Amino acid sequence: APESAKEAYAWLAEKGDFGHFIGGAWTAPGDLFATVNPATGQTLAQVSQATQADVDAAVKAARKAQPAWAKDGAARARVLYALARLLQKHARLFAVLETLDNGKPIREARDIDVPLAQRHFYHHAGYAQLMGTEMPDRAPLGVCGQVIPWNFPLLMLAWKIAPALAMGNTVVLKPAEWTPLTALLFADICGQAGVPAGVVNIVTGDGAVGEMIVTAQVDKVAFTGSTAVGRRIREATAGTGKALSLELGGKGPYVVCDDADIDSAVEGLVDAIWFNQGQVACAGSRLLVQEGIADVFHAKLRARMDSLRIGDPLDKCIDIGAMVHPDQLARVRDMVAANTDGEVYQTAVPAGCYYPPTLISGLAPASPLMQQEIFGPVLVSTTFRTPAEAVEIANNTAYGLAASVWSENVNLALDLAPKLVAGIVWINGTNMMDAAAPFGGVRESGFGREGGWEGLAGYTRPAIATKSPAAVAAYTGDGAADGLDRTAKLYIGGKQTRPDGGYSRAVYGPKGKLLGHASLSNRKDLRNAVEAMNAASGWSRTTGHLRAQILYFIGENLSARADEFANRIKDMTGKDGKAEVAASIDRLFSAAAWADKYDGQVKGVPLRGVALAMKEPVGKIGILCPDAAPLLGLVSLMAPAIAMGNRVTLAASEAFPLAATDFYQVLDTSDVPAGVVNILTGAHADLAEPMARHLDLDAVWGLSGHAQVIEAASAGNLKRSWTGPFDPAHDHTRDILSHATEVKTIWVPYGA
Amino acid sequence: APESAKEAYAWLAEKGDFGHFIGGAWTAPGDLFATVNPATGQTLAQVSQATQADVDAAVKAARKAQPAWAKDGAARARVLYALARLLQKHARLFAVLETLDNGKPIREARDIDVPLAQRHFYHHAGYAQLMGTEMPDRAPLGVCGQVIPWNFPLLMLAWKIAPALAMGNTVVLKPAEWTPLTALLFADICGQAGVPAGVVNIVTGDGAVGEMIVTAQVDKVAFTGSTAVGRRIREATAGTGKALSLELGGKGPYVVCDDADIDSAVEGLVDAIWFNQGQVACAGSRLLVQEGIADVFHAKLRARMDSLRIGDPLDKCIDIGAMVHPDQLARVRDMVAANTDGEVYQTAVPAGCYYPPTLISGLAPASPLMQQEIFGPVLVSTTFRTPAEAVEIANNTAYGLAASVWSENVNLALDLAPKLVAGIVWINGTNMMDAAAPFGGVRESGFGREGGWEGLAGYTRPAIATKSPAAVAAYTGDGAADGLDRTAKLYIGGKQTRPDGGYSRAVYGPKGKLLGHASLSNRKDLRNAVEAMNAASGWSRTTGHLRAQILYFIGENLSARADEFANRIKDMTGKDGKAEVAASIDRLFSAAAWADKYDGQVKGVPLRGVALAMKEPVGKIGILCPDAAPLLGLVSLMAPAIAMGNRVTLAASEAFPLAATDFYQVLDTSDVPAGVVNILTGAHADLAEPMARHLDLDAVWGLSGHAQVIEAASAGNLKRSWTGPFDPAHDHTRDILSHATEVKTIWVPYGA
Numbered sequence A, B: 001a002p003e004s005a006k007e008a009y010a011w012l013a014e015k016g017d018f019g020h021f022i023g024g025a026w027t028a029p030g031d032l033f034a035t036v037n038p039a040t041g042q043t044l045a046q047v048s049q050a051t052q053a054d055v056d057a058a059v060k061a062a063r064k065a066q067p068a069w070a071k072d073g074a075a076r077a078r079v080l081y082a083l084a085r086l087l088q089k090h091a092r093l094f095a096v097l098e099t100l101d102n103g104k105p106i107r108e109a110r111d112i113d114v115p116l117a118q119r120h121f122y123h124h125a126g127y128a129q130l131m132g133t134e135m136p137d138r139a140p141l142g143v144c145g146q147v148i149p150w151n152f153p154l155l156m157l158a159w160k161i162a163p164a165l166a167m168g169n170t171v172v173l174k175p176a177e178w179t180p181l182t183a184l185l186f187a188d189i190c191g192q193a194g195v196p197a198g199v200v201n202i203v204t205g206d207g208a209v210g211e212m213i214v215t216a217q218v219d220k221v222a223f224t225g226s227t228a229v230g231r232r233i234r235e236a237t238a239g240t241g242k243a244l245s246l247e248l249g250g251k252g253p254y255v256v257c258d259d260a261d262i263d264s265a266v267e268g269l270v271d272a273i274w275f276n277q278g279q280v281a282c283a284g285s286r287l288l289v290q291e292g293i294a295d296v297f298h299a300k301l302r303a304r305m306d307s308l309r310i311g312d313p314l315d316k317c318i319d320i321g322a323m324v325h326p327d328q329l330a331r332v333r334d335m336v337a338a339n340t341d342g343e344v345y346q347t348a349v350p351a352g353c354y355y356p357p358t359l360i361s362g363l364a365p366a367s368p369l370m371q372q373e374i375f376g377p378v379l380v381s382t383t384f385r386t387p388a389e390a391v392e393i394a395n396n397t398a399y400g401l402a403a404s405v406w407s408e409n410v411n412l413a414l415d416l417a418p419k420l421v422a423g424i425v426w427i428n429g430t431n432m433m434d435a436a437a438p439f440g441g442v443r444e445s446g447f448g449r450e451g452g453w454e455g456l457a458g459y460t461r462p463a464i465a466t467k468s469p470a471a472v473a474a475y476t477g478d479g480a481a482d483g484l485d486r487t488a489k490l491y492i493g494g495k496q497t498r499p500d501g502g503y504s505r506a507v508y509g510p511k512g513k514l515l516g517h518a519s520l521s522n523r524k525d526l527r528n529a530v531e532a533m534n535a536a537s538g539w540s541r542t543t544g545h546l547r548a549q550i551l552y553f554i555g556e557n558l559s560a561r562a563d564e565f566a567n568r569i570k571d572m573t574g575k576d577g578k579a580e581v582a583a584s585i586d587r588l589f590s591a592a593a594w595a596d597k598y599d600g601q602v603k604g605v606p607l608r609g610v611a612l613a614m615k616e617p618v619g620k621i622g623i624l625c626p627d628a629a630p631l632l633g634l635v636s637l638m639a640p641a642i643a644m645g646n647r648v649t650l651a652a653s654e655a656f657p658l659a660a661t662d663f664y665q666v667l668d669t670s671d672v673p674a675g676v677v678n679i680l681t682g683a684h685a686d687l688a689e690p691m692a693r694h695l696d697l698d699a700v701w702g703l704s705g706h707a708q709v710i711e712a713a714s715a716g717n718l719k720r721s722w723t724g725p726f727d728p729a730h731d732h733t734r735d736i737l738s739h740a741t742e743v744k745t746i747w748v749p750y751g752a
């Protein structure tokens, strides 16, 4: 007999038609639309489509409540703990309501969704308690606008609300149009938990309401959902100064080596067929099986698939529930109808809201379906010959979120895991989640991390605000001919090169004296620099010891020319340059120091083993330097970036380019490998959009303005972006290390 | 053709008879004794036996130089980097001199000893650079007295001097009597590196000179050597306020499972035979082989041992050098002569200063050789049937330093590693060392860690001093009989218990009002508490989440009785108790927060894989609370200790015991597992020595005085000790987490 929904129905009846939860109170129901149980077609409740005025009021209430909420972290901790206690007390109600609203099996809702939501609040309460003492250099961002998908309604809510509240922010959150009910129940327990009025605001509606929230006067936007919508959100927030995190697409590859525990790998896959829907950090949808075991693996997988029970989601014996909505059923049907490759195996005939577990096997490594978007309870599979080929297939995508690797050999499993492009890799498991273990994407899977200490940075700002120096116009001057050869070039791929466009501008000092000429770089020069960075990919695999040695050489070699660099700075700016040179040397030595000291973090989890939140390079970074600090600005951004294993191309100070061109000889003398540091000079209006747009750059740092253009263009490949503030006079090294790294969490067996 | 020693002989001829290196200068040669090349028997140089006056002068010069040296971390980083560059430039000289002085093969000196010493200085330079910004809460200790053994003379020097200088301390270091030369060459390069006069002082001599240094006016003593000497150093420094680190005995077990890569495990072990001598954190000397592979493993081991080349250590093809001194040769011969068990395999007949690689196999798990000290190039081996038996055998020692585990299976290797009592565990390797990876012991292998961020705490003090409150004499009263039942008891093993001795004292308020009676605990009560903590060993294997939940309950249940506890405090002290109760609740919630957030640190290393510097519980801690803060002192020490997975026995405030006895109900209502928290009341003069002596306690925290008695008694089992300062009104939570944890560094394969 299925679980009783009587208490869920009673709550829905008490709530009647829903308005919104704004300023601690329930508003009048407005423009109502039915929310439907997908398993039965029956209307569960009427829910409102929020108006622009509703969003405005929600944001105004969050803004009003934020200063007093921010003031006492211990008080926030008690509230987060109370919320966790209420989720636990009402766990059966939350679980039944989630099944009624979304269609998922009640067994998943009770055993996974609700317990993980509870633990997220329990765990994050402690971050509120410790923020003042352990993060004293950090402060809240303010108001967060948050948008979540329909696949895990309550758990997605927890992943958004818990860290935001812990760090002293208030929230305006919209649940997915199809699944509002558990978010409304969460709203309904906020008063009992002591959530002060306006600290949590929940508004309901379609994507138009999501766009209203994203474009509202919020300090942070956090979104989980499709990559296509993430691009639109990046564009709609470009130039606003908003903090932005995106958890996007990329259902993960599942690599099964010849020496895997076959039966366990099969069981983890079958247990994930229902889970791996919508946008969530998961693995198993793309199956990569080594040739030697492929036939036995598929035979076992089909047999285990046949045992999955499809039906009434309120029955705790059911494994496969109802599809969330008829539009999602149509998506899966259409995907199947459009595919012509492979062999299709389904355990049942599709009937009503129930789509059967489906395996599409026999695909080639380059088939469209291995890389195309997947809908429904569907797995696609291919084979591989060698572990190196598995890595190649797994990484042959625009995505990089979660992945799973199966092997019984301790050496092979730990060799494969770090080579996968991903923010999460599970060894001998899949879909393992904990509040202490960060998760998030690289590439087109987005950016930012949710969970752990690592997730808190994205909900905070520096406690002491820095300000980027104002732009400086280049000096003008006479323009007489130069009979000497004083025309500086570009530095690309370990050698000087002429600008592709052939042009240079005269550089004058503060009194109008001609100092020399500097090249005007173009998009072709940038293309050449990116090619050089691609050739230097081995730098991203060097040891920290080696990178430290190089940075020490750079510092020593600049020190040997310190007087000369101070003189060049004074020639260009009219101000003594000794202090800027000393600071630049210091930045190099601090970056050298950090190159082998920026440690990953080991997470104890209440699951099997440990989660290793590793630090890895971002990859290739294009950087635009400020006008001020002609040497220190360049060195301050270059040095931490290469210390962390990235390759960089920097557009030097537009106004004062000749300190950076003098720096070419320092790079050469220091044996900086070709392509690790490339330097362009010239007009940042020519370079900002090409650098932010470039599909082969992993991050763009624009510290000379053009923030809107840079952030909008970054949506092409969803590269990370940083547009300041950046004050070169201040030591930003540690903060820059975070801009210069990604967190990759590897889950490993561990006997403690 | 052996390596040329011409330059080494020329340096020795230049320096002639040696004095000491004090205040930046070489002192006159004094009471001279020959230092002898063990391979040839020839005198290399005459070296002085330092006098008390020499030690005093070295300490005085170190003290004079320290304040200026502390001021500028960037300047120290330049000096440390210059020392590393000098070790590298002169690497061939350092390596030859090490071989001449100590007898080790030149191949080891060139490939291992000198490179690791260079790397230690390169790496630690960066900590000097970063100390001001990344460790702003820390300051230098002052002057460090440092004593090192003869097995790795230069490398042992680097492990001592590099962190000490990085943290702004100055040093007085004595090399081992038998191997002074590379330390004297290190002294001779200090001027060239820019070491300010007196920042490094090197004095030579025997153990009497070592004792002079340890008992001198130094702030820190750091020693590597025998456990027996470590005990004497702990006794000689007891009650002086000196920081102390000890890296002692315990050559490590080498666990070879049935599914190990046998050839790799054999090659790793044969390559370690020469290395595993003296006191160093190594593994291989105690071979534990699973029964199924024991015969094949030993057959391969004997064959590979036969390939080791013994002879002139200046020949780069040589694997087994000369024993360091005839006294060490006698030690190994006598050990072999004393053994009557097992089967002795030696690859050659002993001859001159050369003792052959030796395998003593077929021993029972409880054989004299399996547990007693090992000398020479000697391996001892036993077998095991199950991995659980391997763990029992490996842990059946008074030691816990390094260990190695060999298995190809991902589960078994990572399951065995946390179960071993050790500060270092290598998976599928041995003797892996890096400047960023901490190493150190538990149990009778000592305490403290060398290397990494983790090693720096032992070379620093809090920048802001805390002061322990003055003792408070209990109030007196008339002595009338109490017609009511107000005699508090003890709390041991989950229940209240009568004091074994049967005595209680009257407790009076400030004006003489009888408040009740409190038990006078005795050594038997402590014994019962220790037995209860042993029964609660499962607490040390719980999840952080579980421990957080318990601490949250304690905080909630104290909150529910807040007025009652404030009233009890005011009854006893005459001062309002509300703020003390509020602080106590805060400490509980901060410890709850930390219980699942005190993360281990992942070290990138230039070797194979990664090193995981994990946090583990200390185990069982005995704690003596101050008189002041009758509730807050107890709660502040208890809460972070249990949050980190320890079990504790606390002696409550002697003057004001009744807040702690009221707290028994809070523990019971909060479902604290039996034996995790035990509380004794009574006179700390009765309890301090028994707690510090107890051989079944892993640490003693004495925050009520008795520092000399506690520190001297702790030498029995070399338990960790903390004798303050401790101000209950100060939030010590973060520092207490460090007192309450050990660092265990697990080296694992990794493909990045």
Ligand SMILES: CC(=O)Oc1ccc([N+](=O)[O-])cc1
Pocket (backbone or CB within 6 Å): A147, A206, A207, A208, A209, A210, A211, A212, A214, A215, A225, A229, A232, A233, A236
């Ligand atoms: C801000 C923007 O450009 O578009 C959006 C479209 C839809 C949603 N949504 O709620 O799914 C959010 C944002």
Ligand SMILES: CC(=O)Oc1ccc([N+](=O)[O-])cc1
Pocket (backbone or CB within 6 Å): B147, B206, B207, B208, B209, B210, B211, B212, B214, B215, B225, B229, B232, B233, B236
């Ligand atoms: C301080 C003390 O009690 O004795 C010592 C004996 C020997 C040494 N040593 O040079 O190895 C150091 C200290």
